[PDB]
Symmetry: C2
Subunit: 325 residues, 2 copies
């Protein structure tokens, strides 16, 4: 096989996320002493499958996954209906006297990579990344509606200003190759999505985040997604390499653990992907909860000292600041 | 002071839970070496406020709280309709035509004690207790709609049949003094309420649970609540005394942590009183989340070995059993 671009967007996206899963896990393994372990599943011809890749109890990474998922399926105008509050262009209304509720169940294809990495060392940050694509099918399997979602974000317990700069800079650089407008909008969006309402703070220092993105020609968005993937390793590996061998106190371990409880609170209360996954009888519960860290802690009425490093993180989570340029 | 039985139910309930908060904390202190600390806040001329007694880093209890909350306020249909699901006599019907809906507001009072205790030792179980009262008001301040809710339940990581039997038995004995139908009914309800749907198991081995209970004269229900309260120290102190000094391993502590992860999943995804609290304005988040343990863990695809003591717990959380004479 030769001549890519010829190929259907759905198949182009699948191949990209499968290559990046391999490239990213290889990158991460290169700075640890343990391997990611693959497990594969199916719902054959019926509706797809995936490949989960998990690292545990490393010298560098305590727990992480890099999962790829592919879904061929049916979508009721009942459930279709609900996912319009978030997605413009989607169709089948059940109308005030028109619409087109062809009942039935419109076909859909979805695929994505979702990754969460949690280091051992308090000074080395948690990160998360997702790039995905979705489409409906016109009786003849071609894309009716479609969009991309994704982004990457960084979750320090100890704020290192260089690390936040590098991470946000390289994702800005990636999006600036396609449109200078996106970084500011997607950075903002990411400040907003990861807000833990009841804690009045974000879980970390954000990054970029977007969804329902269909504004340009899908072939162009694919290159955007690729360049965004390639912002990850050069920032994240660099960051981990310089934090992973810093010394840590039991108090710094405690603070990380507190910040890991915040992460859990976000993922179990606010995360849309998660809620949906856990609902849905027969879902892959272990896979959807691989985002949770190996350890977390909750302390009653805990408040860091003014001017402490722990309070310095809080300044930026309660009040989101700019990271570069 | 006058005959307390002559006071409004709201006042008698407030008094009972404030007494029980003191009696229960003193009881738990009697088998630790560390003290609970008290914090008390007020809602001024809105009424009332609350009192949390919390323990951290005891020799017997790693984390625990015994909390009392008294609220006076106005229900806007933001709940009078959104509470109706769980409350069958509630009352401000915005009618298809006739029945008198408000606009306007209904005044209410609510008060309750809520406690969660998490022992250091893997062999000593976590426990939870709550007794509460709610009423809307007539224009003259007398109760219109009212109910009690509560119960108590036990959450072992290592199953000891006799602990289950004593905990269930003393609570059955309490309820039997008032009515022998209530324990089967409330025992079953507890089996159902603490089911972690996505994990296909309950968090522990249950106990008793009720809500919306208004089936008798509230004065007799007050006395039922008191006897139920009184089932707690005689079961739980006896249980903890014979578990707290049991030897334990790292691996037993890991299982405890895994079970505590299940506890968190329940409290943050399924628990109604937690959801309510994180969503209500001027809610004391730290009070609401004090139920979460100091430490929890999540392991990917963890399954105890066939025949292990860990698997024996799972027998009983995946399929409830009976515990009583």
């Amino acid at each position: 096989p030769q001549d890519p671009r010829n190929l259907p967007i759905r198949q182009q996206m699948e191949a990209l996320i499968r290559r990046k899963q391999a490239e990213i896990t290889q990158g991460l393994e290169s700075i640890d002493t343990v391997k990611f372990h693959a497990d594969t599943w199916t719902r054959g011809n019926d509706g797809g499958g995936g490949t989960s890749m998990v690292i545990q109890d490393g010298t560098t990474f305590e727990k992480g996954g890099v999962n790829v998922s592919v879904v061929y399926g049916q979508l009721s105008p009942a459930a279709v209906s609900a996912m319009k509050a978030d997605h413009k262009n989607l169709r089948l209304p059940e109308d005030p006297k028109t619409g087109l509720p062809v009942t039935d169940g419109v076909k859909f294809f979805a695929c994505g990579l979702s990754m969460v990495i949690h280091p051992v060392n308090p000074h080395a940050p948690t990160t998360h990344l997702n790039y995905r694509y979705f489409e409906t099918w016109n009786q003849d399997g071609t894309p009716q509606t479609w969009w991309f979602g994704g982004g990457a974000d960084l979750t320090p317990s100890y704020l290192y200003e260089e690390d936040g700069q590098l991470f946000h800079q390289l994702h800005k650089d990636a999006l600036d190759k396609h449109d200078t407008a996106l970084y500011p909008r997607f950075k903002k969006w990411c400040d907003e999505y990861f807000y833990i309402t009841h804690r009045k703070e974000t879980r970390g220092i954000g990054g970029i985040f977007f969804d329902d993105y269909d504004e340009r020609d899908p072939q162009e968005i694919l290159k955007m997604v690729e360049d965004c993937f390639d912002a990850f390793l050069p920032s994240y590996l660099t960051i981990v390499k310089r934090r992973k061998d810093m010394p840590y106190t039991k108090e710094e371990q405690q603070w990380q653990a507190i910040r890991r409880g915040r992460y859990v609170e976000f993922n179990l209360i606010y995360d849309r992907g998660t809620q949906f996954g856990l609902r849905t009888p027969g879902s892959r519960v272990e896979s959807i909860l691989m985002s949770l860290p190996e350890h977390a802690s909750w302390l009653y009425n805990h408040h860091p000292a003014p001017g402490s490093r722990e309070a310095k993180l809080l300044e930026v989570t309660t009040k989101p600041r700019e990271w570069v340029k």
